[PDB]
């Protein structure tokens, strides 16, 4: 028997729409936002850029939060991943993810994802930006990306903004947004802290694509 692409958690219909209309709304908040604007500069080497349509690549239907990204078995450590008993045991059940932050950067849009203890069982257990942080900082919801990134990268650039805030570099609110306040961390990086953490329910199992 052969895995799937991946493991992950895929949020409910409902779950999905609400955060991705947050999403939507929050690229369109960030891009009318004069301190983006201001720096532009730093986000594209090449006025007003509208961010929804920058990040053209988007989810299609359902969002999920990825575990273990398996390739059918391919991928080093996927057998080891999928055999063991807490992910069989998890398979098919319900889970609430909690999203504490959005983030913006030149490549993805995503949201943060902070694991309870329960669900980093089901964290994989095999990066240099992985240093110093947790294990799970790097768990996400992608919203987006640009037109030649590649998958893998949302994760990667939530790790960044997490080293940058590890370091005291998150830098005084440049703003405020309905949801939260709004930092800017350079390098057309950009994060916004939910005053209220947004939960979602979904269903932890594999994806055959
Ligand atoms: N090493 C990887 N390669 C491809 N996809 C990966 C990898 N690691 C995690 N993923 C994720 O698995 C899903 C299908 O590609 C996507 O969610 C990938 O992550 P994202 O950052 O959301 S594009
Ligand atoms: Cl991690």
């Given at each position: 028997?052969?895995?799937?692409?991946?493991?992950?958690?895929?949020?409910?219909?409902?779950?999905?729409?609400?955060?991705?209309?947050?999403?939507?709304?929050?690229?369109?908040?960030?891009?009318?936002?004069?301190?983006?604007?201001?720096?532009?500069?730093?986000?594209?080497?090449?006025?007003?850029?509208?961010?929804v349509?920058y990040?053209?690549?988007?989810?299609?239907?359902?969002?999920?939060?990825?575990?273990?990204?398996?390739?059918?078995?391919?991928?080093?450590?996927?057998?080891?991943?999928?055999?063991?008993?807490?992910?069989?045991?998890?398979?098919?059940?319900?889970?609430?993810?909690?999203?504490?932050?959005?983030?913006?950067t030149?490549?993805?849009?995503?949201?943060?994802?902070?694991?309870?203890?329960?669900?980093?069982?089901?964290?994989?257990?095999?990066?240099?930006?992985?240093?110093?942080?947790?294990?799970?900082?790097?768990?996400?919801?992608?919203?987006?990306?640009?037109?030649?990134?590649?998958?893998?990268?949302?994760?990667?650039?939530?790790?960044?903004?997490?080293?940058?805030?590890?370091?005291?570099?998150?830098?005084?609110?440049?703003?405020?947004?309905?949801?939260?306040?709004?930092?800017?961390?350079?390098?057309?990086?950009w994060?916004?802290?939910?005053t209220?953490?947004?939960?979602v329910?979904?269903?932890?199992?594999?994806?055959?694509?």
């Amino acid at each position: 028997d052969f895995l799937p692409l991946y493991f992950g958690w895929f949020l409910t219909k409902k779950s999905s729409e609400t955060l991705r209309k947050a999403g939507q709304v929050f690229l369109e908040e960030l891009g009318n936002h004069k301190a983006f604007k201001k720096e532009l500069r730093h986000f594209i080497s090449g006025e007003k850029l509208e961010l929804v349509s920058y990040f053209g690549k988007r989810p299609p239907g359902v969002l999920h939060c990825t575990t273990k990204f398996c390739d059918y078995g391919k991928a080093a450590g996927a057998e080891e991943y999928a055999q063991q008993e807490v992910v069989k045991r998890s398979y098919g059940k319900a889970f609430k993810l909690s999203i504490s932050a959005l983030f913006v950067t030149p490549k993805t849009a995503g949201a943060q994802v902070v694991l309870t203890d329960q669900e980093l069982q089901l964290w994989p257990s095999d990066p240099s930006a992985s240093e110093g942080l947790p294990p799970g900082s790097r768990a996400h919801v992608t919203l987006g990306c640009a037109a030649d990134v590649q998958p893998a990268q949302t994760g990667l650039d939530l790790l960044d903004i997490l080293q940058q805030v590890k370091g005291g570099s998150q830098g005084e609110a440049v703003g405020e947004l309905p949801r939260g306040k709004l930092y800017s961390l350079g390098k057309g990086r950009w994060m916004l802290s939910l005053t209220k953490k947004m939960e979602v329910k979904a269903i932890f199992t594999g994806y055959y694509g």
